[PDB]
């Protein structure tokens, strides 16, 4: 089927974040503790190890399906990503599948035409909506909301917009709020009723 | 191929100021290449800016100076740019727009190939693994460059960054680890330059003898402002042809992408676009991405690429746009620092502030030795701290320091001394340099080496 | 010795610390809010041009 | 209790007419039906967003930070619904909550919304910082009306008096901390000890309070009181002779 990218698939109903998500991280897990179908930031400065947080969230996790996102992380890092993660694997009943057979990825490097690194954050939200909507919890991380924003000022720039504080257009805010708003826990729409989650995991490059 | 004559109009609508406005046009194309013919005969050359309906635009490169209403005539190749590109290219020098500033003839086309180029297939990259020789002290122990690392120089006007650049010329090479030279090359690229500083890089490229393995292009800063935009392209298109088609590393180096940035904004105002930030285009940012980023390494072969611009800073202005976004494009950075020219080093290069991105893969036990990321880290540590030290002692006095402390000092003015002045020609090689650092490491005890892990002191430090 | 070494010692220390709590709390914010507003100046007026 | 809705998945443009409908139910209920409406509103910030973006697709005069150059036209329209009427029982009273971008006040929006209304209740991150449960800072607080609803009649003579002497107490408190983050503890003097003794009580008492407390006027003023007792009767120079000739002991 098709569906249009910018709009948002009707859901029955939205519940509160009920049920707690953990990871193997012992920090994240008992200091501050995150929950299922929640929204969390971390910073994307070089040096950390935004890896770690990444492949851990990969491995250890209760969601069902993962899906992976980019924005432009100048070329040679995307080649580190889409070869190291492809690798990974995990105990499954005893079983290795390391085909990571749980997770999907969406990969723009620096060049690509200016609206699919625009594009691609919410072709993330929908196809995550898409599982979210076969009753399952699903979990996305994107590698940077700074290259969406940046995106987002040049199509603006190129529009010849009137341009607002720091250079950046008034789309901003609101764009923002919409993109974090989209998920939550929800129950889905169907006779064979269910319930599925959807959690956001965005980095920050200040 | 174009299998049609082609066409000769006499139409001239008008002309406004490096444009030219044309009517009666069958079926333009939008980047089709023309031909002048004037009153007097001198032939000129302009691409197709902008199109619509039977009118059309074209700039004319070499200036729209004695253009009449009647008598002036124009052609079309009914053809985008296209290059010509052949191995044999090396040991020629070109003016960017093809013709050869040397005595030799035209090259010969080997194939032809579309300037604009097209994009990389992301899952086709391959992360770096070996590295480039760059017969700078600093470049190669403090950081280094893997066959794919991207990194620019920032300077500021009044540096030596041209003689940095002509040194890199001089000295490129790869590391022989115990099939050949064959396997690099380099394409040398001067945007916007004095003449000056100019013929300079054409008589230090051939008095060396580099001209072997060096392919030129210089552009003046008198010349046509497309030609700027055009030449580092085509630099690019070759080295691309040179490196993939045939198995050959290459190391691209570009200098004064300012002006390149300038000829960039000169080209937005002929098209009547509204400035962005600070008069530059907003669309300055998709320009850049498209000249970077065409280097690394690909499955199924084995040539790779190695990118190396120089910036220059307006007024040390790091937050300026164009220092900026190269930054956010590109993986670390290597400073100039104005003091150190002052004292008459004659590599300014600095430390402190410098950085490598992937250092920690382009060398290893794999390469030239195991020892080099400790020695790294530890004289990085060293320098810090003995910066810090110089700072105290300017105000605590040298009469309360303790015998450590002066060891530090030591360490800072021999450094300065030795490791990181080079000379104009005086060559190192990697394991040289790993030497040296040993020599200034020695200076203090086995303990005080905190860093280095006790197995490589117990080898290398006795 | 030592006794009128210790007394003087203790006021230079606190003079010390008197410059140093000057330049730390009272200095700096004035400049930077300085500098933030040069900043927003110069924006608006790009923006009317 | 009437609800109007507007998640931020709602379309943009819609926010501009969302709060005048609200409005005009509220003056409906309020002018024809003489009730008293208490009306609340959540984000003005997010309907200036809307203005501006709808201003900017029309290229109109842009003036502070890109803003439609007839803001202030457009938020005195929908603030100007209060007041009561001659002749109708009714009241309409607005308390609409705006969101600075951040700490700065000079901000357009903050600044025309004081232009317009009569005063406002700042609320500060610092005491947040602190887990005061009231983070106001009654500092920049400042309301206009106090005039012709405090005095005799209605609460007490002495209620404007104490409030004036809590503010001069309250700034010279941060004043003497000021000094202290410079100078040091033993620089200071007795009087700058009763500042800070002030000023921690205060905090500690005035305004700290429950989430479900609900404390009277009347107990409000003795614990002002009590405050003002730290002080000696000789200090106390924004209070008439007459007044704690009477109250201070």
Known sequence: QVWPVRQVRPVTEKLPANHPLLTGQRVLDALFPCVQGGTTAIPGAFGCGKTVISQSLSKYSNSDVIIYVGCGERGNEMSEVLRDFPELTMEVDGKVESIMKRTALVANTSNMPVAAREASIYTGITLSEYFRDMGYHVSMMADSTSRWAEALREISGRLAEMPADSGYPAYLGARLASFYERAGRVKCLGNPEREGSVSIVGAVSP | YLSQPRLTYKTVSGVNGPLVILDHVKFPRYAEIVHLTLPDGTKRSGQVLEVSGSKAVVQVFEGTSGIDAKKTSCEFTGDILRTPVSEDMLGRVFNGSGKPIDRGPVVLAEDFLDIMGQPINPQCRIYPEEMIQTGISAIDGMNSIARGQKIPIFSAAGLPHNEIAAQICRQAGLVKKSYSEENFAIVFAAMGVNMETARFFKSDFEENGSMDNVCLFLNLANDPTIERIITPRLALTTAEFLAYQCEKHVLVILTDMSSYAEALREVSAAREEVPGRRGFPGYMYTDLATIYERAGRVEGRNGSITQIPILTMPNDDITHPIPDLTGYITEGQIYVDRQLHNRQIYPPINVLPSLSRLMKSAIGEGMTRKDHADVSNQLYACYAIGKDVQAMKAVVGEEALTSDDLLYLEFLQKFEKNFITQGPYENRTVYETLDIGWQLLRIFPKEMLKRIPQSTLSEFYP | ?49
């Open chain 3, 1 to 49: 010795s030592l006794q009128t070494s210790f007394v003087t010692l203790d006021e230079a220390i606190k003079i010390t610390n008197r410059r140093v709590n000057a330049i730390e709390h009272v200095i700096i914010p004035r400049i930077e809010r300085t500098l933030a507003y040069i900043i927003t100046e110069l924006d608006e007026r790009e923006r009317e041009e």
